[PDB]
Amino acid sequence: PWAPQIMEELRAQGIPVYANLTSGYFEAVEVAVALSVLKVIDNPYQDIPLASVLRSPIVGADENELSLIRLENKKAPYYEAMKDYLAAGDRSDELYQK
């Protein structure tokens, strides 16, 4: 349990560290996001994995752009709202292109 914080501190001091770990893989943000992509490909009607992929550097939608997506359709699944924004939006906008 103490190993991670230690590794961080030693790197702060500049020392090279190597520890064989058996946990914490799914806490990595990269893993969480890449997984989220996989889930979304499996079934897009999962609001949180979708939103996760959207806000990720993969798409790069910001908070305003996200809330903008919601605005097109409030009651529906987030995926549907995304579909609708694509339907009503114009090619000129950046968010539409993302």
Binding site: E8, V29, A32, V33, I48, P49, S52, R55
Partner: protein, 172 residues
Amino acid sequence: LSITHSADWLGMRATPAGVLYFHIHDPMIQSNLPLGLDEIEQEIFKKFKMKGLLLGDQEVVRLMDTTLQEGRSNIINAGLKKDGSLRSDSAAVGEKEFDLLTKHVRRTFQEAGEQITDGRVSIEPYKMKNKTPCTYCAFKSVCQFDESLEENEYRPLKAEKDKTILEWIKKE
């Protein structure tokens, strides 16, 4: 709400007696001493002693536990000594203290709502007694919170003693 509308809602203006939690469960008794049936029943009963906050009065506690004559209560987290005064280990505070907390809540509501309308959506997880919201939160993959990554830090919240909290309320 119950106090502010008390006069209008049912008839007359009232005074904050206390806020109580009731633990709904079917407890198991862990006894090293052999217990008769009545003693078991009593221990089971004791397991349902309500936690929360009270107003320090002989009248208030006695009203909440009419069995209590002297000593500790098995219903409310308060007691009466031989002298008769409320004993210090009781979870009771002054009417003024109640008023302080109650005013404070509305302070929080006002500010929070204001920040909500202002468009504040910042990732600011707190950390108090090693406890964080993040574990109980489904949006960990949306926020993509990364402590290592700079400008992404927990809000240290102190496990301050109740007495202090009240002092700070007084100041504010």
